Specification:
Protein name: 60S ribosomal protein L6
PDB class: ribosome
Family: Belongs to the eukaryotic ribosomal protein eL6 family.
Strand order of the largest sheet: 1-2-3-4
Radius of gyration: 22 Å
Entry title: Cryo-EM structure of Chaetomium thermophilum ribosome-bound SND3 translocon
Keywords: membrane protein biogenesis, SND3, ribosome, co-translation translocation, insertase
Strand content: 15-25%
Distance between the termini: 48 Å
Structural class: mainly beta
Bound molecules: magnesium ion
Helix content: under 10%
RNA sequence: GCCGGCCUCGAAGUGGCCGUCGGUAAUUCGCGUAUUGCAAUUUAGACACGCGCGGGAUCAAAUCCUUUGCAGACGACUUAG
């Protein structure tokens, strides 16, 4: 499917050069361990104390305050 | 906290004990919270002020004008109507 294009630009589009910015895993703080009780500083559940379950890829955390203990469900938050 | 008796509070009007009426985890629980989607002021208060509801209360003055001369450049002022 390397056919001729239906349209051609007025002048050749400049391509960007290679960036050399490899993606490397985020390293969470030593205090972010599973089961740690954390206070939510912002968002809908600001001021709520929830339980950390897992650390996600790019500074995101999976937490749940026990929904029957406080009305926080399973939720993603930001480690910051 | 809400309203009611009262009793005392004059440096620029204060607090109280006596009652009503409400709400109230000191302990332990049972249901609800989710979807504001990974943060985005937590629009939440008391000072007002201007209003409209629908009532109570109340039914006033001032100036011009004329007049006086204890006054006066004109205003103003002292009077009287
Ligand atoms: Mg009671
Ligand atoms: Mg004279």
């Amino acid at each position: 499917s390397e056919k001729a294009q239906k349209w051609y630009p007025a002048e050749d589009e400049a391509q960007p050069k290679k960036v050399r910015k490899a993606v490397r895993p985020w390293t969470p703080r030593k205090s972010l361990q599973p089961g740690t009780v954390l206070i939510l500083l912002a968002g809908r559940f600001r001021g709520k104390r929830v339980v950390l379950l897992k650390c996600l890829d790019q500074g995101v955390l999976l937490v749940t305050g026990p929904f029957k203990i406080n009305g926080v469900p399973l939720r993603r938050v930001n480690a910051r």
